[PDB]
């Protein structure tokens, strides 16, 4: 039911490359747009959008994983006593490799880059 309603009564063209193709090259923040703006326009983002070409997005999960990791590592230079925190670090880095296993098969450059990328941004 749901999907047909969105497609018909939204907009699709014009309103969406203007609102959303700016904010994403400003810096990411796809979820920000849906939680503001003029509703009907973003109604059909899920029901008609692959994603325009962009820097980030495919890179966001990988980038985020490194970004959180470095701060945990910083707090593992101060006190060894954080026995809880070391196993969050252990868990999250082993999840981090999963992200760049799946998002390495569809596109080039990723295969070489993402192994090195761990811990250096």
């Amino acid at each position: 039911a749901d999907v047909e309603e969105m497609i018909m009564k939204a907009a699709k063209k014009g309103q969406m490359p203007s609102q959303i193709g700016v904010v994403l090259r400003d810096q990411h923040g796809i979820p920000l747009v849906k939680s503001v703006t003029g509703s009907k326009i973003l109604r059909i983002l899920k029901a008609h959008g692959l994603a325009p070409e962009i820097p980030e997005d495919l890179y966001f999960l990988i980038k985020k994983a490194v970004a959180i990791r470095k701060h945990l590592e910083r707090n593992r230079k101060d006190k060894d006593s954080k026995f809880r925190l070391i196993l969050v670090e252990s868990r999250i880095h082993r999840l981090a490799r999963y992200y760049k296993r799946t998002k390495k098969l569809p596109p080039t450059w990723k295969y070489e880059s993402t192994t090195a990328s761990t811990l250096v941004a």
Binding site: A1, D2, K9, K34, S35, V36, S39, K40
Partner: protein
């Protein structure tokens, strides 16, 4: 009675669609909605997502609109709203 499933399966009560998760539903939809929220300061009324997330302000008037909360938005002070969207 003996019911697993209903006597009229096709139309269940809304409370029994509040049972099952959004994904699980017989007819799935957003239970979430769009609404137009009404502000004296602006001539027009602005369409808003039910779960605000960001502290949405009205476009022309710097009145505010609602403040966010864990579920559907917690509206602040005297404001009014109708539930509609196209």
């Amino acid at each position: 009675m003996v019911l697993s499933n209903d006597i009229d399966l096709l139309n269940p009560p809304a409370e029994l669609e509040k049972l099952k998760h959004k994904k699980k539903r017989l007819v799935q939809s957003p239970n979430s909605f769009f609404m137009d929220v009404k502000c004296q300061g602006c001539f027009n009324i602005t369409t808003v997502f039910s779960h605000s997330q960001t502290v949405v302000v009205c476009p022309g008037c710097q009145t505010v609109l609602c403040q966010p909360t864990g579920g559907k938005a917690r509206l602040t002070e005297g404001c009014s709203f109708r539930r509609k969207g196209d």
